[PDB]
Symmetry: C3
Subunit: 446 residues, 3 copies
């Protein structure tokens, strides 16, 4: 809650010209990112009017715009005619490879005469030409250019006298009313940790025919041959495969590296070495795809869960005169805390600089009331990148955890086994419990 | 308005050391993006002091920094010597193509004997790089800075403006001193253009219409790569195949090819990828309204950015007076980029543009809120809009509301509820109907 | 200060179920980016003196190591004299000799031979070998910026109790007073788009962060398959398009050294560098050195306003605001090129000016000041105001200078701006800067 007060709100009617003045109670208040429970309420004297606010989980949705389709892994098929006649040139009546149709330009591959190299392979003692044709993997992906992030949430105002009524201000519905009470969402304050710079990257969704969004990849424009003219880029086509620099003096599948498959396989290898993948959309979550699945949007939508604080400003205008704030102050306990690698490869520590840790913390509301809690990773040892605090609305008696874990970074590529952090837990002003995490960080390799 | 109150503001003078305490009325209040009219006012009791705030149209300006010049469409020119002698190599003083000037490296082009070489068989030929007369200057865009101005009209016939803005965070007028704290975060973030290269045609059409904004991936800055906006003499000569490649082989994907490809996108009811009009929705007129100089670039801000202004008045007592004029939605349509057609768009591969005409059906200039809510399945939510409309007069959303679908499904009965609110309650609502023909490819 | 008021704050205990209501004074206030000094204070009724200060704001970007990169790979041309150059794969004794990095023979490290630009020089054979500069660099992919600061809330009864709410510690308390940092408002000038670029730190073994570069992903061959990029290998150097028909160092352009040198040439022509991390500051590396983080950290000083919202809850009933209002004087103002190449002006559009302003607190009290560059001539890009907390009698300056831009590539020598200095509401002095802009070349 920002500040309460009394003000005479006058309304000069647009048609009648008559002004109607009524003294109202104008209360501006803060609604946190993780304020998903009925912890606090406001009581207005008019019998008291109980008003309580809750904010849905915040999401940063990016609009999709289809660009082109990209194949999972194109392949070179070396055809040896046996009749020793290969003629695959431009404006050719009948090439060995044959034209690809949706006649696609430069889809006829190339001929080569006499690791080994396209030409060197043709040289058989027993036999002297061969065609090199581009073929596509049965699986295709569709490339979508992500747009600008827009914060998607919903604020639920539960007005009660008796009979209860729910008001829903949000981003598309900034204002809401119910005769005695009219509330307006002004907007929220800036996030301390900005969103990832993914507002221009290309999202790779597999064209149908394991989990919804698990196979998805997000690629930088630097790794894509959009025109299909560059070599060894996601989208290298027939025009790039044919006309490649050396051609016959290069090993087969030469211009076919750096494809979706290759990048996917490379990312698996990164996860295996306890390093964060570079292309898999799970790089933002921390390993699990389940976090993203919880998003409300349609099949072709992309949104990341927001972990940074975004305090929404809501102004309430009540005809009632007098206000009181009532808040639940239930104690808590940290029922576990561990620093683990990407996708829970291992625990206890990570690789300095070349990788990052993920702080998973289990907490428990040790009371009879549903209360809001604040988890802080402070008083850390040398060269540890500070982590922004977290809010947790936890139900009475029940236990909770940070679904997207807190990312952990080190500002030195040093080898260590005794690195520490102080995991504090606060409830509605004062600290209820604290533990001391211990992370190891095996020095950066290369 | 955030919250009003009374506080004793004491000032310990820096030279005299004497403290001067005066009880003042401290009022913090928002100022919306589209609050360009005198709708609401504040009355302070000291005869009432009428104070009213307005915010100019918001713009996100990006600073320009010249990098290099880029040609419109470099062309390959094929010369057949007839004397059957092609002289084009490094150190050779009289090449067939001739050096470009002093002597630019690899400008001599290249030779092909017996696609380029296949054509010669009718016998050597010379392939020379030539440039289009039109050139464009490349400017690297910097970081966006929100540009606006808040006008505070203090009145007790005597009216006094006060202009707090981004370069002038504070303002005063003896009895009243106001400070712009800053505005809240936009719900829809700005487009990621803070590093792209702006292509302005070098002089010697409309002001900013010919302009293009290109990603750094589509520019060969060193002029060594092929088929990029910046590829030069050194790239044309030394191309992968060379003679075995068709004429105009290294010269694809230039400013002309990108512009041409973009007009084709608009034609197929798809948003262009390079034209600066991709942010507006078709019209260049929206951008022309920007205050800046010839070499400036700014995009109109459509997301809400509620500015926080704190007023300190020596007067004791405050009242808020607001105009509540009704409105009417005098039209609503979902149309393609640059008004190609209306009624619908192409699912995912394109986007719709909601154009809404409204009318202030009253005697007072009032603020209105337009919302596109209660939409059908897989429709991407659209953030609300504010409209300060003069009495009796009609208005429209100049930059239209962008419309997206979260499925590449073929549909003809897609719906949205366009509600119009005036200073708390809904005065009218319509029901838009969009068709989305499924994504092709 | 936003708004003060009185409210009954009730606490329903989670275990005892008993509600405890206490009427408190709830004050929401604003702490500026450059509010480092004790200028203003709050007096709660013997008065309780409470004063807020905000540390210098920084935008830190998390590092993630990608790969290592050499300073300037060099081509060493060897002419064997015995006229025998045989450098191919699987040959045990090549002229260049194999490179060993993992105790094993690195592929394509043998270079290439040329008979009778690389072959024109020989005029009968020669070897072309790739060698590395002793200096190596480490490529780190920058992550998303996170604002790093600390708010210090001094409480005085007697006893000096100092509270520290910040980004990792949003809340703080001290029995009578409990404060919460809600968050700060959005910056008018957004941060530079560096959240995806690759930071080049030289591998150890002149100044900490001076040699550092920040490169766009377009300028690196990560797979090492492209020619003339920051990352082109032995493999890229060999198998190059022409080879023997191209001048030495043909596939070794645009390396770290090459870019660095190009940037010194830009600074020399009074233009802002494109790769040097000093492009954000204004020339000096000293500004960045002041950052609290570890050796492998990167943060830029925030010059745009970021007003933090802090709400104070005191059991005391009654509040008064006391502020120091010391006058000031602009003791110099100049528009200078990057890294102070020259002064008086800059190059229109192709470059930018840097407004350096010296100010002086001409009073007995430490006070907060506002510096504004307003009422400027035609086609001058507006500059956001600055806050300065200056100690009594002492002089101060804008450490990161105000960037100056022109919205026309016109030649002008009489361009003007009105530099105004405000102190805790009213303007105490004003000068009139005069910049020259020599028109854009090319
Ligand atoms: C948290 O609890 C889950 C079960 O809910 C358990 O599997 C996990 O090991 C716990 N982690 C920590 C850090 O306590
Ligand atoms: C809005 O009104 C203009 C004329 O004022 C008209 O050209 C346009 O078609 C109208 N559009 C809608 C959606 O009503
Ligand atoms: C500011 O003062 C320093 C010395 O304190 C001097 O070196 C510098 O040139 C001055 N600059 C201006 C613009 O007054
Ligand atoms: C990281 O360091 C710890 C230190 O106890 C362990 O030894 C662990 O095995 C190290 N990891 C690697 C991959 O060497
Ligand atoms: C989009 O679908 C609607 C469905 O009624 C129309 O038939 C329209 O013609 C379609 N557009 C195209 C280009 O096929
Ligand atoms: C910039 O223009 C002014 C105009 O008076 C000066 O002549 C100055 O010498 C110019 N700079 C250059 C490099 O020509």
């Amino acid at each position: 809650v920002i500040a309460s007060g009394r003000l005479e709100k006058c309304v000069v009617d647009g048609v009648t010209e008559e002004l109607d003045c009524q003294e109202k109670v104008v209360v501006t208040l803060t609604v946190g990112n993780g304020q998903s429970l009925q912890t606090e309420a406001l009581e207005f004297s008019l019998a008291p009017l109980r008003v309580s606010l809750t904010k849905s989980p915040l999401w940063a949705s990016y609009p999709l715009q289809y660009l082109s389709s990209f194949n999972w892994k194109p392949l070179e098929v070396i055809l040896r005619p046996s009749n020793k006649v290969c003629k695959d040139g431009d404006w050719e009546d009948s090439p060995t490879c044959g034209w690809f149709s949706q006649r696609v330009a430069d889809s006829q591959g190339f001929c080569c005469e006499c690791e080994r190299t396209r030409a060197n392979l043709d040289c058989d003692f027993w036999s002297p030409v061969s065609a090199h044709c581009l073929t596509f993997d049965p699986q295709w992906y569709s490339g979508y250019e992500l747009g600008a992030a827009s914060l998607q949430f919903e604020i639920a105002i539960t007005v009660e006298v008796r009979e209860v009524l729910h008001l829903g201000p949000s981003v598309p519905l900034a204002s809401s009313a119910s005769r005695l009470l009219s509330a307006k969402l002004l907007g929220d304050l800036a996030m301390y940790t900005q969103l990832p710079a993914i507002s221009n990257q290309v999202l790779m969704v597999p064209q149908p025919p394991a989990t919804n969004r698990s196979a998805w990849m997000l690629l930088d424009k630097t790794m894509l041959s959009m025109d299909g003219l560059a070599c060894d880029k996601v989208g290298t086509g027939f025009s790039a495969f044919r006309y490649q620099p050396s051609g016959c003096g290069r090993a087969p599948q030469a211009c076919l590296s750096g494809q979706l498959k290759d990048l996917w396989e490379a990312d698996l290898a990164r996860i295996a070495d306890g390093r964060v993948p570079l292309y898999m959309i799970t790089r933002f979550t921390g390993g699990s795809d389940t976090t993203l699945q919880s998003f409300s949007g349609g099949p072709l939508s992309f949104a990341l869960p927001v972990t940074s604080h975004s305090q929404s400003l809501v102004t309430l205008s009540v005809a009632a005169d007098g206000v009181r704030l009532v808040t639940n102050r239930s104690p808590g306990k940290i029922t576990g805390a561990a620093v683990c690698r990407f996708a829970g490869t291992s625990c206890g520590g990570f690789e300095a600089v070349a990788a990052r840790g993920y702080i998973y913390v289990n907490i428990t509301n040790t009371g009879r009331l549903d209360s809001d809690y604040t988890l802080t990773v402070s008083n850390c040892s040398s060269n540890v990148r500070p982590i922004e605090a977290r809010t947790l609305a936890v139900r009475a008696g029940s236990a909770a955890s940070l679904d997207p874990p807190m990312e952990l970074y080190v500002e030195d590529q040093a080898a260590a086994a005794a690195r520490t952090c102080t995991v504090s837990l606060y409830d509605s002003v004062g600290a209820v419990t604290d533990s001391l995490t211990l992370s190891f960080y095996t020095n950066a390799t290369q």
